Amino acid sequence: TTFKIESRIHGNLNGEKFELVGGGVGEEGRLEIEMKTKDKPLAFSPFLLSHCMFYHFASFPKGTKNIYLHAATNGGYTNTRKEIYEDGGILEVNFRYTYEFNKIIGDVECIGHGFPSQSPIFKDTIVKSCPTVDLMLPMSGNIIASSYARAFQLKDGSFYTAEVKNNIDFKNPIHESFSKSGPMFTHRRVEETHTKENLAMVEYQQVFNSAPRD
Amino acid sequence: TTFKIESRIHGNLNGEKFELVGGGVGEEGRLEIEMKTKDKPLAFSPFLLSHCMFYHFASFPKGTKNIYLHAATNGGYTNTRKEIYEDGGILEVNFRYTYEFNKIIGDVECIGHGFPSQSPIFKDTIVKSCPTVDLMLPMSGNIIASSYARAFQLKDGSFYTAEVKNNIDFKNPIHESFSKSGPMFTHRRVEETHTKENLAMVEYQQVFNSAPRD
Ligand SMILES: [Cl-]
Ligand SMILES: [Cl-]
């Protein structure tokens, strides 16, 4: 099961517009994607776009169907994210998808504002995005509210953090196998190799609903 | 490895004081505790106190030492929590511990304020505390910043949520085995059997630092 991935990220950060285009491939639990800026290099850290660069590619626990792929087969879904950084920077991202045979095309609108001049995203001191574990809650109206804190590791070993919320809006009922009585979690991690002109990343996602050990 | 647990929870919620006393036992990855209110039954849902009722009892991944038990052997640590509920209720909890041979005594001060009259904690509609996965970040000064969202499941199947932050303050350096380059997570769940006079709970905690599957 290997789908082709296509994406375009557009928007602006602190008033300056940017645009990236690219793609890659995804399978159960892993995706790889490479994107390039158009017209000019990025005016801020490329690591801020790593999470902007497809929930469809997470592996699910036995017994629970992949709700994102299931939705893609009917109506689909959108995801709206808001990241509130500890220094006041706010990143708002809206994910919309279109599907073709064996291919998912993402349209990502990203608006960043309120990042101070001293922010790590301008000092270019971020070296990697740390892993996260998302709490997903099925809610009335075919919505899933997702929440988690995240951190970027900086050159000196310290972290730059944000509190993140996602509103996943499904056109149709979320697959019944996805228990709506309790929450499920998604562990996510990425491997990044970026420059201000060419971004590259591999991402691993795993949905789970029980402790790792016994 | 079976430690005796002792605890006293005291404080007030929306101005009315309350006090509970009790104890139980804990081991690697599991604890059980029973507590009773003093003088009067609780004026709000006992489920709000489940998480107030010992990080020491989590199992750790191979290679990482239990930082809480390690600290207990030297200087110890305190934990300060703030839960911000979606309806404005705020619960502030401070955990302090004293140790005796084979026993941990918790002193828990709990202050709740701003809960509206219509809050689920007064309608008594909460039926259980959902599991959580905490993101732990080692920070300068022997502190660990912990963050996660949590939810209570209500009688009608819907949820009552909060965003939670914990500031774990260690007297001495956190054990070196606890990598300070990246974050670690703690999966936690509880089994509750409460009345407004007698609370009982079993809790399972697992610290992990890698996806559950391959
Ligand atoms: Cl511009
Ligand atoms: Cl009182």
DSSP state letter for B131: P
Test A137 with B147 for CB contact under 8 angstroms.
Answer: no
**Cα(A37)–Cα(A21) distance, integer angstroms:** 7
Solved using? X-ray
Provide the shortest C-alpha distance from residue A190 to chain B (in Å): 12
For residue B214, give Cα distances in angstroms to A59, A166, B98. 10, 26, 41
CA A144/CA A150 separation, integer angstroms: 19
Measured from the alpha carbon of residue A16, the closest ligand is: 1
Residues B52, B33: contact at Cβ < 8 Å? Answer: no
Q: How many other C-beta atoms can be found within 10 angstroms of the C-beta atom of residue A185?
A: 23
Q: Which residue has the tokens 């690591």?
A: A47
Cβ of B151 within 8 Å of Cβ of A130? The answer is no
The structure tokens listed for B35 are 């507590």
The token pair that represents B15 in the structure block: 């101005």
Question: Which ligand has its closest atom nearest to the C-alpha of A42?
Answer: 1
Pick the ligand that lies closest to the CA of residue B11: 2
Nearest residue of A to residue B213 by CA position? A206
Across the interface, whether the CB atoms of B139 and A151 are under 8 A apart is answered: no
The shortest C-alpha distance from A89 to chain B (Å) reads 19
Sequence positions preceding breaks in chain B, C–N over 2.5 Å: 53
Please name which of B1, B10, B144, B3 lies closest in space to residue B77, comparing C-alpha atoms: B144
How far apart CA B145 and CA B151 sit, in angstroms, is 20
Q: What is the DSSP letter of B65?
A: -
Question: Nearest chain B Cα to A211, which residue?
Answer: B187
Please state, in angstroms and rounded to a whole number, the distance separating the CA atoms of residues A210 and B189: 9
CB under 8 A, 24+ apart: contacts of A77-80? A77/A168, A77/A169, A77/A170, A77/A171, A78/A168, A78/A169, A79/A55, A79/A166, A79/A167, A79/A168, A79/A169, A80/A166, A80/A167, A80/A169
The answer to whether A31 and A54 are in contact (CB under 8 A) is: yes
With 0-12 / 13-18 / 19 or more C-beta atoms within 10 angstroms meaning exposed / middle / buried, residue A62 is exposed
Q: How far apart are CA A73 and CA A70, in angstroms?
A: 5
Tell me whether B78 touches chain A (CB under 8 Å): no
167-196 in chain B: CB under 8 A from chain A:
180-183, 185, 187, 189
Q: Which residues pair with A44 in a beta bridge?
A: none
Q: Which two structure tokens, joined as six digits, stand for A193?
A: 């190799």
Question: Given CB atoms, is A155 within the 8 Å cutoff of chain B?
Answer: no
Q: Alpha helix (H) ranges present in chain A?
A: 67-72, 120-123
C-alpha dihedral, A31 to A128 to B147 to A91, nearest 10°: -80
CA B188 to chain centre: 9
A145 has a chain B CB within 8 A of its CB? yes
- DSSP secondary structure string, A121-139? HHHT-EEEEPPEEEEEEEE
Partners of residue B199 on adjacent β-strands: B35, B194
Token duo for residue B188: 């936690």
Strand partners, B214: none
Tokens of A192: 């990044």
Of B137, B148, B213, the CB nearest to A159: B137
Contact A56, A69 (CB under 8 A): yes
| Partner B contacted by A143 (CB < 8 A) | no
Q: Rounded to an integer, what distance in angstroms lies between the CA atom of residue A81 and that of residue A105?
A: 18
B23 phi, psi to nearest 5 deg: 175, -165
**Chain B closest CA to A17's CA: distance in Å?**
32
Tell me if B50 sits within 8 A of B20, measured CB to CB: no
H or E, element range at B121: helix B120-123
Domains in chain A: ranges and CATH: 1-214 (2.40.155.10)
Number of helices and strands (H, E) in chain B?
A: 2, 13
Instruction: Report resolution in angstroms.
Output: 1.9
CA–CA distance, A140 with A173 (Å, rounded to integer): 10
Strands A198-208 and A3-13: unpaired
CA distances from B151 to A61, A209, B147, B148, B212 (A): 21, 15, 14, 10, 22
- Helix residue spans in B29-91 (DSSP H): 67-72
Q: Is B28 on the interface with A (CB under 8 A)?
A: no
Whole-angstrom distance, CA of residue B21 vs CA of residue B38: 7
| Mutation for testing the A interface, residue in B159, B184, B190 having most A CBs under 10 Å | B159
Q: How far is B165 from chain A (nearest CA, A)?
A: 10
